[PDB]
Amino acid sequence: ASRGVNKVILVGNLGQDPEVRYMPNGGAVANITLATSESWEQTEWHRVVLFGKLAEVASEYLRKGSQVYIEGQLRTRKWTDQSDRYTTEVVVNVGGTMQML
Amino acid sequence: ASRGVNKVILVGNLGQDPEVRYAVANITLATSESWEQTEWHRVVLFGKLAEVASEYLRKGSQVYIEGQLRTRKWTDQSDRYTTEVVVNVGGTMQML
Amino acid sequence: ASRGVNKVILVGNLGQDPEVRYMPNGGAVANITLATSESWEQTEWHRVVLFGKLAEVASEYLRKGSQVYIEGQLRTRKWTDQDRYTTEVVVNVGGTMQML
Amino acid sequence: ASRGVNKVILVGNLGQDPEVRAVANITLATSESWEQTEWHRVVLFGKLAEVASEYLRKGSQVYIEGQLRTRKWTDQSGQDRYTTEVVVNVGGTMQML
Numbered sequence: 001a002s003r004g005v006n007k008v009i010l011v012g013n014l015g016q017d018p019e020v021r022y023m024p025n026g027g028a029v030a031n032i033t034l035a036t037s038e039s040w041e042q043t044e045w046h047r048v049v050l051f052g053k054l055a056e057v058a059s060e061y062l063r064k065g066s067q068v069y070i071e072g073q074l075r076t077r078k079w080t081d082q083s084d085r086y087t088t089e090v091v092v093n094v095g096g097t098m099q100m101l
Numbered sequence: 102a103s104r105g106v107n108k109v110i111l112v113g114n115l116g117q118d119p120e121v122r123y124a125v126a127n128i129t130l131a132t133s134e135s136w137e138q139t140e141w142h143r144v145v146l147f148g149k150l151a152e153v154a155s156e157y158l159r160k161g162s163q164v165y166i167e168g169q170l171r172t173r174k175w176t177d178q179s180d181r182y183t184t185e186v187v188v189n190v191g192g193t194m195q196m197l
Numbered sequence: 198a199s200r201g202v203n204k205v206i207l208v209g210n211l212g213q214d215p216e217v218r219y220m221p222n223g224g225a226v227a228n229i230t231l232a233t234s235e236s237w238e239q240t241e242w243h244r245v246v247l248f249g250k251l252a253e254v255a256s257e258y259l260r261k262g263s264q265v266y267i268e269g270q271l272r273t274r275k276w277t278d279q280d281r282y283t284t285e286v287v288v289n290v291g292g293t294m295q296m297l
Numbered sequence: 298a299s300r301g302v303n304k305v306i307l308v309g310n311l312g313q314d315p316e317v318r319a320v321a322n323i324t325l326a327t328s329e330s331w332e333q334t335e336w337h338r339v340v341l342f343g344k345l346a347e348v349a350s351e352y353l354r355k356g357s358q359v360y361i362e363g364q365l366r367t368r369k370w371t372d373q374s375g376q377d378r379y380t381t382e383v384v385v386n387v388g389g390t391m392q393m394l
Contacts, residue, residue: 004113036105201309
């Protein structure tokens, strides 16, 4: 990891059961939408993606309203649609973690 | 303001000098990772900080950032979503 | 708070109900010992002190086994008993506590 | 290794040069203001330990991410003593700024 730090920590509940899929060689890719709100109620939705082991467990133990802790990195990946688009996500890979609260 | 923790910590370098329009500086940083692959963040500072960055942050500048993620919805010339790291309430920025 | 970043993030459980105490002018001080463990087990205990509002709430809502999220700073303070140091996670400025 | 999250993030400067014994002990200072500086006892192992010994000198500014660990030791008077430190192990990390 040259250059600075890139890290996000989230604590929220999934607004929907874990969308588990399996990419080609090595099926293991889970997608969760984490919700975190605040007052002073303004809520924000998060697109997280878990891999390998974290994916599976996500799939086996995580369900809609579940609350979880997430430590991941911020990544924005572009893609041209059936019509250029960009989507930034919180990916959990290397020094990352996911956990049931 | 409970129910969940929205927090991103960043340390890295600016791509271009601070684009301050109006008490709001928009800064885009870079964070490399190797095993190359750089990643670019859209950080947005307000009030006090906005001005400090404007006055002390130049292109190369290395900084520490702590804010929250916010995805905002806008329609363009012809729907679009832009997620950025906003240093608001309990956030903070500093020169390294 | 220029120069450096002092910040710890904890998620764990309270080992025992919050020991709330009221300081001189403006009583609001809570003391919680947080437990975080690691298997692969090996646990580690943390002293956490809350203040004002967060203190009150802890008192009211937290109990023994409850699980929390803590964000604060590290402060080791010296005191000679009857020379010693005690390091703790203190929730002051940009800190926070949350029941999970 | 669940049940709770033990994590401290630090950015700051070394008091002395790295005291290497693969294990580097460094101490870090983070000041606050409203002065009042605070001193951290950081411990690096293996790979990082050596890097620190090789590139970190007194003034060096570094980013640290580790876990808190309080160690219980006895001490010549045969009295119990406790020392908490920031240990950069598993998912930890250190970097020069």
